[PDB]
Amino acid sequence: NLDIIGKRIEKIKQEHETSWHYDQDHPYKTWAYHGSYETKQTASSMVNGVVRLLTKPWDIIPMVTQMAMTFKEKVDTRTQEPKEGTKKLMKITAEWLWKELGKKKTPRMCTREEFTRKVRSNAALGAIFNKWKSAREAVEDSGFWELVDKERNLHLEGKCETCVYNMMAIWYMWLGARFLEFEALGFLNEDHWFSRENSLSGVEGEGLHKLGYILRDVSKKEGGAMYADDTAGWDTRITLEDLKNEEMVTNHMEGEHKKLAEAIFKLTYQNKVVRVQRPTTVMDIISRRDQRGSGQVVTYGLNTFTNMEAQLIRQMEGEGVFKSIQHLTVTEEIAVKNWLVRVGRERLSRMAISGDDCVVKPLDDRFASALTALNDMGKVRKDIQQWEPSRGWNDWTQVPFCSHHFHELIMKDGRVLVVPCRNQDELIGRARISQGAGWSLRETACLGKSYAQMWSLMYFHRRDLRLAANAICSAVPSHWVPTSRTTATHEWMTTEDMLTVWNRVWIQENPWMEDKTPVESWEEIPYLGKREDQWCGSLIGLTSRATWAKNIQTAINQVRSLIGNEEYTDYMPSMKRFRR
Ligand X SMILES: CCS(=O)(=O)NCc1ccc2c(c1)OCO2
Site string for ligand X, 465-504 (x = CB under 6 A): --x-------------------------------------
For the CB of residue 498, give the shortest distance to ligand X in the complex, in Å.
17
Does 233 appear as a known binding residue? Answer: yes
Does 421 interact with Zn ion (rule: CB under 5 A)? yes
| Contacted by 147, from Zn ion, ligand X, none: CB < 5 to 8 Å by type | none
89 with 247: CB under 8 angstroms?
no
418 with 406: CB under 8 angstroms?
yes
Of 439, 430, 487, the C-alpha closest to 126 is: 487
HSE at residue 557, side-chain half, CA atoms within 13 A, is 4
| Contacted by 552, from ligand X, Zn ion, none: CB < 5 to 8 Å by type | none
Does 382 appear as a known binding residue? Answer: yes
Name which of 518 and 529 has its Cβ closer to Zn ion.
529
Residues in CB range of 271: below 8 A, 6 or more apart: 4, 5, 287, 289
Does 34 appear as a known binding residue? Answer: no
Name which of 74 and 576 has its Cβ closer to ligand X.
576
Q: Which of 308, 536, 549, 556 binds Zn ion (CB under 5 A)?
A: 536
| Contacted by 163, from Zn ion, ligand X, none: CB < 5 to 8 Å by type | Zn ion
Which 451-470 residues touch Zn ion, going by CB under 5 A? none
Of 92, 98, 90, 96, the C-alpha closest to 376 is: 90
Helices 208-219 and 441-458: crossing angle in degrees, nearest 10, is: 20
Does 530 interact with ligand X (rule: CB under 6 A)? yes
Name which of 284 and 464 has its Cβ closer to ligand X.
464
Does 577 interact with ligand X (rule: CB under 6 A)? yes
Does 16 appear as a known binding residue? Answer: no
Name which of 139 and 163 has its Cβ closer to Zn ion.
163
Which 102-161 residues touch Zn ion, going by CB under 5 A? 151, 160
Breakpoints of the chain, after residues (C–N > 2.5 Å): 42, 70, 129, 168, 280, 487
Q: How many residues does the chain have?
A: 580
Does 110 appear as a known binding residue? Answer: no
Distances (CA, A) of 41 to 192, 283, 434: 39, 11, 22
Largest CA distance in the chain: 78
| Contacted by 536, from ligand X, Zn ion, none: CB < 5 to 8 Å by type | Zn ion
Which 546-575 residues touch ligand X, going by CB under 6 A? 549, 575
Does 230 appear as a known binding residue? Answer: yes
Does 461 interact with ligand X (rule: CB under 6 A)? no
Of 48, 42, 94, 84, the C-alpha closest to 67 is: 48
Q: Report the C-alpha gap between 67 and 47 in whole angstroms.
A: 10
Does 303 appear as a known binding residue? Answer: yes
Residues in CB range of 61: below 8 A, 6 or more apart: 425
HSE at residue 40, side-chain half, CA atoms within 13 A, is 2
435 with 43: CB under 8 angstroms?
yes
Does 52 interact with ligand X (rule: CB under 6 A)? no
Does 525 interact with Zn ion (rule: CB under 5 A)? no
Does 356 appear as a known binding residue? Answer: yes
Residues flagged as binding site: 151, 155, 160, 163, 230-231, 233-235, 303, 356-357, 382, 405, 407, 421, 536
Residues flagged as binding site for CTP: 233-235, 303, 382
Give the residues lining the site for ligand X (CB under 6 A): 463, 467, 530, 540-541, 549, 575, 577
Give the residues lining the site for Zn ion (CB under 5 A): 151, 160, 163, 421, 536
Residues flagged as binding site for Zn(2+): 151, 155, 160, 163, 405, 407, 421, 536
